[PDB]
Every structure is written in structure tokens, then in C-alpha cells.
Amino acid sequence: LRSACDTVDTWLDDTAKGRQNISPDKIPWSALKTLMAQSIYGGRVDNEFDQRLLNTFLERLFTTRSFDSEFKLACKVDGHKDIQMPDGIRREEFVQWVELLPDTQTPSWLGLPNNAERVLLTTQGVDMISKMLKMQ
């Protein structure tokens, strides 16, 4: 994450040469995506299908469309509702958006099927029973 933050700052400063408002289409999306595809979060990947998955997220999230009003971070999490991109221009607006996220996270937030947590949740529930019983 820190390396990705430095890369974002390095290339944004390179393009926006001391300016107040850089055009979204002038943001170096190719530089940011490739460096994260190959070096940052990419250097750990030793699997082509995991590499393709990493490329898929980077291609979806880092474009000029991310600055549009109706950008969609996730689609159809619960079948009907989905997560919208906040229309913020300042940091505090984004932090407010994060704090207003519901406590109803499902693996569909991650692009996974909602049944991915079924076995994992079931084991923990049995694990909680075993731990409670042991302390009795």
C-alpha cells in the first residue's frame, strides 16, 4: 500500500506539474495500472490466473470513468442494490462515505459469489460453540 501511494504521488506530480485541478483523462492511468500490475501487488503473484484477476480489478478501478458521477465500485451485491462511487473531491468526504458503509458486507462486495462465506461462517459458528463449551 505504501509503495502504491508513492507511485500515485510520483506520477501524479509528474503530470500535474504544480497545478490545482488535473483533468481526469490526463491522469496517468497506464502508468499507475502497469506499475501495480507488474511491481506493486504484482511482484508477489506467481500464478497467471491470479495475475489476470489482479489485472481485472486494476483495469476496472483505475480509469477516467472512476471520476464519473455514476461510477460503480461493485455491482449487484445483494442482487438488487450495489455500491456507488462517492462524488467527493476532498478527503473528508471519502472518509464520511466509508463510515456510512453498512455492516452487511458479503463476498459479493469483492466480486465473489455470496456462498463463498457459507462454509467459512459455518465452521466459525461451530468453533464458537466449542470454545464456549471448553471454557464452561
Partner 1 sequence: KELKNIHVCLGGLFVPEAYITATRQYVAQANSWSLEELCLEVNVTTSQGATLDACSFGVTGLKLQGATCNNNKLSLSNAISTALPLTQLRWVKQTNTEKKASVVTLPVYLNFTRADLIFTVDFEIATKEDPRSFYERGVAVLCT
Which among 37-45, 86-94, 97-105, 113-121 is the span making contact with partner 1, rule CB under 8 A?
113-121
- Contact by Cβ (8 Å): 72, 84: yes
- Contact by Cβ (8 Å): 58, 33: yes
Q: Does 88 bind partner 1 (CB under 8 A)?
A: no
Shortest reach from residue 112's CB to partner 1, in Å: 6
Q: Which residues contact 86 (CB under 8 A, 6 or more apart)?
A: 93, 94, 97
For the segment 34-73, give every residue that binds partner 1 (CB under 8 A): 47, 49, 52-53, 56-57, 60
- Contact by Cβ (8 Å): 14, 28: yes
Q: Does 22 bind partner 1 (CB under 8 A)?
A: no
Interaction site with partner 1 (CB under 8 A): 47, 49, 52-53, 56-57, 60, 110-115
